[PDB]
Amino acid sequence: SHPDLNKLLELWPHIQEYQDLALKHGINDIFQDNGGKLLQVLLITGLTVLPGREGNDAVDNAGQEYELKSINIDLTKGFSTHHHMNPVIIAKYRQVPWIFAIYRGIAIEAIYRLEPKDLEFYYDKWERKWYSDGHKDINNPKIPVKYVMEHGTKIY
Amino acid sequence: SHPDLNKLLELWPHIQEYQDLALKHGINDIFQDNGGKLLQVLLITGLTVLPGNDAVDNAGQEYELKSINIDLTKGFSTHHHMNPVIIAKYRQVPWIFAIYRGIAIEAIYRLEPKDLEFYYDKWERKWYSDGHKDINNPKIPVKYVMEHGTKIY
DNA sequence: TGACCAGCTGGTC
DNA sequence: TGACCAGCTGGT
């Protein structure tokens, strides 16, 4: 084993507690799909992830659904979307506002809300491309953090 | 907003310290790609990750590292679009399978290329028989890993 | 950037 | 068991 394993063992009880808090809030895996980051957004915003949800989508206390996206700005400046983007995928969240969270690594820095009207520019862009090139899936097209900060409404 | 935020703030320094430890060991995000669990496997096995979750041992041998939570599912994920190009890379290295119950690590197995060929052959044959259609995440059963691999933890 | 290159997984019949 | 249906991203 590596010598740093002892440091890991010292930190584990707290990691455990964090996973327990995540579970208490509907997140059963903090180490995948930004699970440990999602928990921060949820506790700050008041949003919830329901059992049996489709992916990282949440709802407010009024039942409104939201698509939640996370980005590590220490590494990239474009929000990922879907590995096989096409009109069917766009339809999945065309009707809901999106919550974009910006992180420096694992720590939350800001959160923005964009309404469908704010995202139409990208839905149309992707549709336009798909219709022209023989209906090919787009491999994870990105939404600029700059675009999100300019068009969205900061909520954290 | 939610009252539990204070608990999260209480736990944060330690979580950041864990992320710092992962960073020191070449893992950029403990909350993606099983980052926090891959660190544990690297620290237990002595393997290291170079600048996928692929790792290398002290002799330079590369490995594919897989992880699974056995409380939820019975089969290890492979690739969302399995085809001969992916299988070609796979055949080149042994695989390290980590088994978890929640976040509690239970065991780690090593399988040699010869021990996974049964599946590479199956996946290859199917890709052609389907009309060159990628397979969507075929699974390698935990049972298979335990019966054909060597327990290293 | 536009648009193409990548990986890490769980679920249910 | 195998076959299929899904998800979250970073990198250039």
**Residues 59-98, chain A: which have Cβ within 8 Å of B?**
72, 74-75, 83
Q: Residues of B39-68 as b/e, b for ≥16 C-beta within 10 angstroms?
A: bbbbbbbebebeeebebeeeeeeebbbbbb
| Number of other residues whose CB lies within 10 A of the CB of residue B132 | 9
- The tokens describing B61, both together, are 């041998």
> Right CATH number for B1-153 from 3.40.210.10, 3.40.718.10, 3.40.50.20, 3.40.50.720?
3.40.210.10
Shortest CA distance to B5 belongs to which of A34, A145, A43?
Answer: A43
Q: Scanning the structure block, which residue is given the tokens 């698509």?
A: A67
Compute the nearest-CA separation of A151 from chain B (Å).
Answer: 24
> A36 CB near a chain B CB, below 8 Å?
yes
**Cβ pair A137, A154 in contact under 8 A:** no
Phi/psi of residue A71, nearest 5 degrees: -145, 145
Closest Cα in chain A, distance from residue B134 (Å): 13
Which residues on adjacent β-strands are paired with residue A104?
Answer: A107
Residue B129, classified by CB atoms within 10 Å of its CB into exposed (0-12), middle (13-18) or buried (19+), is exposed
Within chain A, residue ranges assigned H as helices are 5-24, 35-45, 87-94, 116-132, 145-151
**Within 13 Å of residue B113, how many CA atoms lie on the same side as its CB?**
10
**Is residue B83's beta carbon less than 7 angstroms from any atom in nucleic acid strand C?**
no
Give the technique used to solve this structure.
X-ray
End-to-end distance of chain A based on CA atoms, in angstroms? 42
Between CA B134 and CA B137, with CA B136 as vertex, the angle to 5 degrees is 125
How many other C-beta atoms lie within 10 A of the C-beta of residue A129? 14
Beta strands in B5-114 (DSSP E): 55-56, 62-69, 75-76, 95-101, 104-111
Contact B15, B27 (CB under 8 A): no
Joined together, the tokens standing for residue A60 give: 């407010």
Q: Which residue is nearest to nucleotide C2 (CA to C1')?
A: A141
Tell me phi and psi for residue A107, to 5 degrees.
-90, 125
Q: Do A107 and B80 make contact, defined as CB atoms within 8 angstroms? A: no
Closest CA in chain A for residue B24? A4
The number of angstroms, rounded, from the C-alpha of B109 to the middle of its chain's C-alpha atoms is: 11
Q: What is the CATH number of domain A1-156?
A: 3.40.210.10
Give every strand in the sheet of B62-69, ordered side by side.
Answer: B55-56, B62-69, B95-101, B104-111, B150-151
Q: Tokens in use for B16? A: 């950041």
User: Does B126 participate in catalysis according to the annotation?
Assistant: no
Active site residue A124: no
Q: Is A62 exposed, middle or buried (0-12, 13-18, 19+ CB in 10 A)?
A: exposed
Chain A hits for B11, Cβ within 8 Å: 14, 17-18, 21
B11-38 burial by CB neighbour count: b if 16+ within 10 A, else e?
beebbeebbebbbebebbbbbbbbbbbb
Choose among B18, B32, B80: nearest Cβ to A11.
Answer: B18
- Classified as helix, coil or strand, B117 is helix
Exactly one of A7, A29, A60, A69 is catalytic; name it. Answer: A69
Q: Say what angle helices B35-45 and A5-24 make with each other, to 10 degrees.
A: 160
* Amino acid at the residue A10: E
Query: If 0-12 CB within 10 Å is exposed, 13-18 middle and 19+ buried, where does residue A15 land?
Result: buried
**Tokens in use for A68?**
């939640």
Using the beta-carbon criterion (under 8 Å), do B11 and A21 form an inter-chain contact?
A: yes
- Spatial neighbors of B79 by CB under 8 A, at least 6 apart, are B86, B137
Report in angstroms the alpha-carbon separations of A40 from B35, B44, B50, B111. Answer: 18, 29, 30, 38
The helix/strand/coil state of A79 is strand
